[PDB]
Design a protein around this ligand. Structure first.
Ligand SMILES: N#Cc1cccc(-n2cccn2)c1
Length: 209
């Protein structure tokens, strides 16, 4: 059972700008998603200091980067706090509305796309490199869900029946045909070293076979 939702007009406008604007510095998408994963890990860590049982769904706090050339996907997995259904459908978009307005004001004031993460909408930089984004997520207080959007003004949410995750978020980037460099080990290593060198969680770059 798949539910289809419309993005808010302002968010759809931001995704169109990300997809259609000429901007060669696409590699910043990885910095932004790793930063989001680090924030999600900080949140479950801090919550567990006063309720240890919040880690019953998984004690390890980490980030995995998993490329797959056969599927042409780059997957960013974290074991952070995850997202509720209300997060996916309402709450993140409510924050993103004011951040988007602030970001697009900065952009016409001379700022550039790389600054997007300061406005809370860094997740959408995924569409610099991905034609479709699938997000699998599990919060301690909700079920496992799959969020998915190919932009174009709508996204879907369904209950996810696949491999149970325990807790956290998996972002699956279905890469555009001309962005397969982000499946190469040396390229991902370069980007992590350049932009994410001091993240306080183990980042494991998986190799393919
Ligand atoms: N991972 C992730 C994810 C999934 C759905 C929506 C969002 N999101 C909306 C505004 C800011 N982030 C992030």
């Amino acid at each position: 059972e798949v539910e289809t939702f419309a993005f808010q007009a302002e968010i759809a406008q931001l995704m169109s700008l990300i997809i259609n604007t000429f901007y060669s510095n696409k590699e910043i998408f990885l910095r932004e998603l790793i930063s989001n994963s680090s924030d999600a890990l900080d949140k479950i860590r801090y919550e567990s200091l006063t309720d240890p049982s919040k880690l019953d769904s998984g004690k390890e706090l980490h980030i995995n980067l998993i490329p797959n050339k056969q599927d042409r996907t780059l997957t960013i997995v974290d074991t952070g706090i995850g997202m509720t259904k209300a997060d996916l459908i309402n709450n993140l978009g409510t924050i993103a509305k004011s951040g988007t307005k602030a970001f697009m004001e900065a952009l016409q004031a001379g700022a550039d796309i790389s600054m997007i993460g300061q406005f809370g909408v860094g997740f959408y930089s995924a569409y610099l490199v991905a034609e479709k984004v699938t997000v699998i997520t599990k919060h301690n207080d909700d079920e496992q869900y799959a969020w998915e959007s190919s932009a174009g003004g709508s996204f879907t949410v369904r209950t996810d029946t696949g491999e149970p995750m325990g807790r956290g978020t998996k972002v699956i980037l279905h890469l555009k045909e001309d962005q397969t460099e982000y499946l190469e080990e040396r390229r991902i290593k370069e980007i992590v070293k350049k932009h994410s060198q001091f993240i306080g969680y183990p980042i494991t770059l998986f190799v393919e076979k």
